[PDB]
Design a protein around this nucleic acid. Structure first.
Lengths: 81, 83
RNA sequence: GGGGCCUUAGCUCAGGGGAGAGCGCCUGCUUUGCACGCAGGAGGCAGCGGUUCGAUCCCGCUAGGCUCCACCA
RNA sequence: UCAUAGGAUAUGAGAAGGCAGACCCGGGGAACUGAAACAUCUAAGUACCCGGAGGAAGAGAAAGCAAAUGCGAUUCCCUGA
RNA sequence: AAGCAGAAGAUGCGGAGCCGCAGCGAAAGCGAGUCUGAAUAGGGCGCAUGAGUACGUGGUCGUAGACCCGAAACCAGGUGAUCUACCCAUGUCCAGGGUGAAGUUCAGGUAACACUGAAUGGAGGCCCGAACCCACGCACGUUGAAAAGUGCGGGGAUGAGGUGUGGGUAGGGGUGAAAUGCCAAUCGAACCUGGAGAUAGCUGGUUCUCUCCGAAAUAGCUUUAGGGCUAGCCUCAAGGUAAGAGUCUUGGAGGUAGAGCACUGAUUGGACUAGGGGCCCGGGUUACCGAAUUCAGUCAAACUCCGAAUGCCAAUGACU
RNA sequence: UAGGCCCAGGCGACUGUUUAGCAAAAACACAGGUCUCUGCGAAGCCGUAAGGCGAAGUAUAGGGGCUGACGCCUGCCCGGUGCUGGAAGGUUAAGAGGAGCGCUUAGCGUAAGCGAAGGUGCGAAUUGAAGCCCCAGUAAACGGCGGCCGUCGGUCCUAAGGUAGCGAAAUUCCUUGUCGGGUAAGUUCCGACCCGCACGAAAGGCGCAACGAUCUGGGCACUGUCUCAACGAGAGACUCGGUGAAAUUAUAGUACCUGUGAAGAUGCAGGUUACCCGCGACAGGACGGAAAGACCCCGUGGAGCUUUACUGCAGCCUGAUAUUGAAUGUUGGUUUGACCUUCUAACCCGCCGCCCUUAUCGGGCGGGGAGACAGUGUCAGGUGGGCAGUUUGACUGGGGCGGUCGCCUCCUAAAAGGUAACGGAGGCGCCCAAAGGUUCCCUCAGAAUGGUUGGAAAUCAUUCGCAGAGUGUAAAGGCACAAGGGAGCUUGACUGCGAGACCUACAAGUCGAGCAGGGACGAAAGUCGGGCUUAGUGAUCCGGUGGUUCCGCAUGGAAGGGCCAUCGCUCAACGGAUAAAAGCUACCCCGGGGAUAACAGGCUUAUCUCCCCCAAGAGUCCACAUCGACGGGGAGGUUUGGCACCUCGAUGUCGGCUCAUCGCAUCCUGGGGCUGUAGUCGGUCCCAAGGGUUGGGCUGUUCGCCCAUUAAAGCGGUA
RNA sequence: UGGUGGCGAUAGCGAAGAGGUCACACCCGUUCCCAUACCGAACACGGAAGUUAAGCUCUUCAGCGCCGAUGGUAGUCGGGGGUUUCCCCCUGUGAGAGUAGGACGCCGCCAA
């Protein structure tokens, strides 16, 4: 028998549950978050706000819609009734 | 430090071997006490020595190990010579 | 094979801001003087890679060496 | 030397020892265990040993409870909990 | 309730006490409000959306041996030196044979001795070898004749001897020519009783039937990994009730397969060529090497100009 | 019936003793040697103490440690640890002390508040022993006795670097070291050599006559130990009569080939074979019986043992105080206490005499000796494995050792999210008082040109230039309308909060518009509750600090507590068992496991063995007579292994003996092809498994080497 | 023309041309506001002598960049099969790349 070891590549961070949390056409309350992220994969739009964690929340109640800032750049927005 | 190392760095004796030899002969002493190459030293020490009949008394000011040549003699001072 | 330490001038050493302290062998010189010297042999970070404006000095991979271990049936 | 120790004698239904493997009063006083280990702690002042008892013992007539136009020895029970 | 009366009873008396009806606050305290707070703000907890209580059955839990059996072990108090270890006191046994010391005498020898040879002498943890004692070598026996022996040989056998009798040392201890050995067929800490139904995240076992429903073997944390807790998955009941699910349609996020080289890296070949040579007179040639640039080409989990199917999230209605 | 003998060697001097019941010994002991302690109430030891052994002894004795007759010897280191002694100085307890500080309160007080005395609590200076720090000595005390470079020298370090003697050893892995002896042959033995992995001088070194049921080697004699068995006697066995158990046991009318299957079938499938019942024999199987595996692992199991693990205890040393008082001096500040001397009456005497008393107990008297000491009690400090109770992590492709343990980023990850492995790569345990906020401003890196020092590369103007730069830090995402770079002013790096969401077992973590208060920048809109986002940190309990229209056990205060804010932990094993903790077990034990290791079996076949492909090349020439490179593809399941599937309520494991059996990839024999086959002998290949396929030395050995033979001295499977 | 907004560069890059009395710009000077880490380049302040050169508008083009079909193919849910480190068949879906081609602008409000 032999003896070996020392992998030193055996860890990783805790998974942080990013991505969208509400869907297009879905009704939303005030203050609800929509898209956890890091930096801006997506920007805010109308009646939507960004936080210190680059997270997107609805300032009001309404319905969600995702769109594009012209080219190669996305957006969300809340539109009320 | 040790006596033999001190003597070499201070260039009193050119060889640590010779320092050991003389200390084993006991030709020398420290503070009136017979001593050995392993004898501990320090600043302020008063050292008696022999070279045949030439007896010497010196005083220890400093101690180190890198000890370039002319800076060696700064390590100590002569006091007196007898025979 | 694993872990730790080390691998700087011929030898021994220190030193992230530019590798420098001492010592020795051989030869030569040298001379009035109680071994009191001098010049040359020669003075070069084990190697590879990376970070930095920079690496001996931080990190990593590998080699050479020293020590420790390599047990139970 | 008094004198004392000590000795001698006579009286004593003295006390000794036992128990019922239970109850109580005290002197000594474990560990396992639990704590998911463990030492503080618990188990537990238990078990056990010892000495004393009595039919009960122990405590008991306030150097108290308390905080109201105050209660009046101890003990034990229900509550308080 | 205790308690009194009452046949060991039911019952009556007994309202001291307990639960609830109002909560909030750490608390003072306030009160359907209260706490925070500077705040008539907001927010939390509460009320408005009210039913508890006593008793009984059943399920479950907690504390007690708490589903049953099961340890090795620990402590306390006692019993044991009739085995065995050692010691004390007193007794006793060791067939026969051999060796031949010291000393003494004689003789030689010496100045004396020393020394030498005989005789006597009779020592010895001396020799050989029975009883006796011990156990190395083998064989046999190994549900034996025997819970350690027998047979054939073996060692010691007048010395640290063997043995008897009577005694002593007692366990957190004793004894030990020391092996951790012996201490009543036991000993890395004796045996009996008791604590004690020790404890056991461990194994084993857990007794009649039928019916309804029906899993998990995953996450997280754990001196935790074969255990446990919560969540997940099952069941029962009461409510809400029709939210759930499937498909169709519509819209979304998401950058995987694939593909590609626009980035980062790796890479092939060619062209030109900076530059550096070698050749001739500061030039003038060389295909001798050759940067970059360029043409075309291959590749990638940690590379993307791109980008699906599926899946995922929702909305509308339709159908089921 | 009563020795077998000899040669040589190792170990131990010897006779003796020992694991009753596995081990008789090289172990123990021994006489001898040495060290140390101890002045007699010895010392040591037992005991709580009395009382005792020591010893009815007295340093030529007694106790303890080490070594082991005898002979020659027993080298260097005292640096460390121990002991011994010293001890000027530092540090250090309890006790004494008693400056001050609080609290309370009479009183003063308009109030705030101050506040004497007393009580109470806390209390500084000062003093305060041993011990420790420190200095010497000691090695037949613990213990230790080196390396580098050069062809004896030079050098580094040491406290010192192994003297003599011995040496492949009871120590030597390499190793069957080399040589020689012995032998046909000698991994053994002997003698020498020494590059002693890792001898060595009282853990004694070397030698050594005698001794040994010691270990080892060689030789003579003798033998059924063997070649290779044969016969005979007796006891069992066998038959008959009498008597008559046991272990075990799910029921059983219980066959073998292959295969399957929890991977090794009697019992299953298919096929083959087999009349029914017994007796004597064998022992291959029933993974046979026996013994809940003694190995391995696990248990927050146990016991024993060690120690510079933790915490404690005994014991010992030391000090204060009470017993414990009378003096003479001395020095201190206020008489007082302390210190040195002295005395005696306390206390003590395992000293004498007398009486109790025929008494070595004690107890009274008298003397004597010591003496306020000692001893004892209480308190305190130190030492203290002598002793006790306990701890001594987990994961783990068995365990151990290694490595890791929490957080962040990416890939793996399968286009939501999430997703493991001792899978792959890297980072954090911070930083900035401006690197924050706001307002306003502008836009990078590199390249080509020109230009002193300027240089390939500063700085320069210059056009090209989505971005090749930067973004405090790792990476990913993202950002150039800035989140990047400058300047001004400032501190929102605020207080109270928070609808509603995310993530989530919980604990927790994350985002958040908006309200109020008060502000900063800005004219204004308006932004600001830290930073470009993601890490940069830890519970509770316990204490500490500050503040407080809270409580404060009769009342007023207070102590103390609560609330708010905050500090203290690599508790890193990072959801932290305690404030406090390491090891050995081969003397071991219990509970469990095939959930987990060693043998064998099974799957795989990297490895191993064998076969084959291309064919360069060797082969004088010639690839293929025979070899066959770089490379490639397969078979087998004899190796080393990997995985853990049966077995831990037991599957006995190497080698050897006996017994064989099977395969063929054939060693011989047989039959052939080719040949770099003249012949004889051979090489290679093909078919062939019928039969056969040696005896010895060394080693436990397998294997292997050697001697001598043989036609040949085959390779493997069958637990 | 000018200002100001919206739509993915089908808007852009690049080349060629035309215009400016009004307008927009360039441009002329700092005395003041203010400013330039240097300064009237820029920012501000005022002015209008001259210039369409540049900027800005209007035309042209398809060289660069941009958009982008159809068909086919890879891939693929699902079903099935096979000599299974992979491959094949079927309904369905369906890219990228490469093409066809499109395009050097569409829409608004105000002022003269």
């Amino acid at each position: 028998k032999k003896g070996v070891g020392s992998t030193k590549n055996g860890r990783d961070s805790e998974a942080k549950r990013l991505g969208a949390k509400r869907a297009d056409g879905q009704f939303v309350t005030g203050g609800s978050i929509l898209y956890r992220q890091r930096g801006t994969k997506i920007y805010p739009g109308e009646n939507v706000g960004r936080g210190g964690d680059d997270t997107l929340f609805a300032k009001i109640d309404g319905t969600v819609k995702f769109e594009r800032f012209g080219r190669d750049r996305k957006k969300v927005s809340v539109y009320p009734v | 430090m040790r006596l033999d190392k001190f003597l070499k760095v201070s260039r009193l004796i050119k060889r640590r071997t010779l320092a050991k030899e003389v200390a084993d002969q006991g030709r020398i002493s420290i503070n009136g006490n017979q001593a050995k190459a392993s004898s501990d030293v320090k600043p302020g020490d008063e050292l008696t020595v022999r070279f045949g009949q030439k007896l010497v008394t010196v005083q220890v000011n400093e101690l180190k190990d890198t000890t370039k040549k002319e800076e060696a003699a700064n390590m100590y001072t002569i006091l007196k010579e007898e025979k």
